[PDB]
Design a binder for this molecule. Sequence first.
Ligand SMILES: C[S@@+](CC[C@H](N)C(=O)[O-])C[C@H]1O[C@@H](n2cnc3c(N)ncnc32)[C@H](O)[C@@H]1O
Ligand SMILES: C[S@@+](CC[C@H](N)C(=O)[O-])C[C@H]1O[C@@H](n2cnc3c(N)ncnc32)[C@H](O)[C@@H]1O
Ligand SMILES: [Cl-]
Ligand SMILES: [Cl-]
Ligand SMILES: [Cl-]
Lengths: 239, 241
Amino acid sequence: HMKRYNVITIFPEMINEIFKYGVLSKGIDIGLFRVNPINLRDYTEDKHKTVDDYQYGGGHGLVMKPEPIYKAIADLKSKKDTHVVFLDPRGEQFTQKTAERLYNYDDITFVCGRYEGIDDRVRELMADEMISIGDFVITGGELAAVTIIDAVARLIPGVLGDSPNEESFTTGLLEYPHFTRPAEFMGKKVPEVLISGNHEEIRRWRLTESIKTTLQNRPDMILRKSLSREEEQILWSLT
Amino acid sequence: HMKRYNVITIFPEMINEIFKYGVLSKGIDIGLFRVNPINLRDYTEDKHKTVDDYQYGGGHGLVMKPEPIYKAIADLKSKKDTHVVFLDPRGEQFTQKTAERLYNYDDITFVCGRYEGIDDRVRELMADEMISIGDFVITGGELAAVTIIDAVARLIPGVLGDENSPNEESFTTGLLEYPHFTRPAEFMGKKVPEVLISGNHEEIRRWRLTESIKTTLQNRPDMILRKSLSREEEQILWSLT
Ligand SMILES: C[S@@+](CC[C@H](N)C(=O)[O-])C[C@H]1O[C@@H](n2cnc3c(N)ncnc32)[C@H](O)[C@@H]1O
Ligand SMILES: C[S@@+](CC[C@H](N)C(=O)[O-])C[C@H]1O[C@@H](n2cnc3c(N)ncnc32)[C@H](O)[C@@H]1O
Ligand SMILES: [Cl-]
Ligand SMILES: [Cl-]
Ligand SMILES: [Cl-]
């Protein structure tokens, strides 16, 4: 089935503008997935059409009200089943494994907070899970939503050109360096093996550089990786 | 004099459109910072305006060419000193500590790749550092750039008003934050915790700190381990597990 990603946000047009750029917009154009911005302001009923108000506990910090977010999610669910993700720093830290897990859903609803956060009762009532884009804080869930959609949708066969099979994190490693023309640029030659080597020599050089980069930059990934005999010998030879 | 973030990208209009929205767009309006999309295609010099080409090593996977990126960065540097960040999965995993460190700079240039990545020679020549938005891969550096800018620019005093305080929030404190609530006091039979409605400032502080430690313990025990817990935090933790 076509993968669908609903984004509940006070800035739906931001979501539409973002997805008219790049390889992903072509996948939308041909129907491999679809992004569905939902205007949270459409689910207000008060005279001031209110989606945020002063929180409880003191001060004037703003928190997203529960009723509009509840109504927006219930509206989606009334038409078609969906998997509800609240974007929240308290959630699961988003990694390539998360993206592979979310890939299995055909219909995901992302709820975007603003200001101090989202009233936690509607999260308790409606969320299937919480996901954090990383160990940092941004002003809204919008950027976290589109980033996740990007990471998940690009795994749909046919979205990228004929590869996401050997890239960083997918392999449990950081990828080798890449180069293109010209062969010489400001005194730096492209490694000769990539110009004139055979397949196995290029594979060996890339695997070596990949392990090197991972050991130097992300030793924690090395510890988590189940190494092939060949990868382990290379790792030993750099230590 | 304000903070400036330049974004080298083949999609400058995407960057422009993103910062029309939300609290950051008001910060730009009153001149607390500025975002400058830099059109990488303006720095090609060949007849096909080429920013990417087939990589070396076999196949037709595309890699961003070194010359336009080099020319783009040297142009900025000829105008003003700037700190050059290559967006790349191999870089430092972006955290709140990273955002706090980058806040120090008054001018930051982000280099956005596409396709298989960026020719690593221009990275080696021009990058002051590489940063990864996280342990996953996206189609382009654009989203990583604007996300980092968001996390950094929101720390500029005055960008956020009374609507949110960045001094006490997730990760900044080493913890995950407590739950929040707003009107109405009762929603579908679920009541806002009474302490937030009628407790005093100290009672609210105690409850919030407890829920924060509980949430961090349940969701991110790794964060508990690396935080130097205060005497009070230590005891709350013990009075749980
Ligand atoms: C400024 S944040 C509120 C964060 C909250 N005060 C805290 O410290 O945990 C406003 C909105 O941005 C989104 N957001 C901010 N950081 C996020 C992150 N790391 N992961 C997912 N969403 C995030 C969330 O949807 C959140 O409701
Ligand atoms: C599809 S990625 C290529 C990544 C490379 N093939 C690898 O496996 O490491 C294309 C561009 O998106 C950006 N990008 C992808 N993932 C990123 C991340 N985790 N952090 C920062 N930038 C990222 C980079 O600028 C990169 O040049
Ligand atoms: Cl949850
Ligand atoms: Cl570097
Ligand atoms: Cl410690």
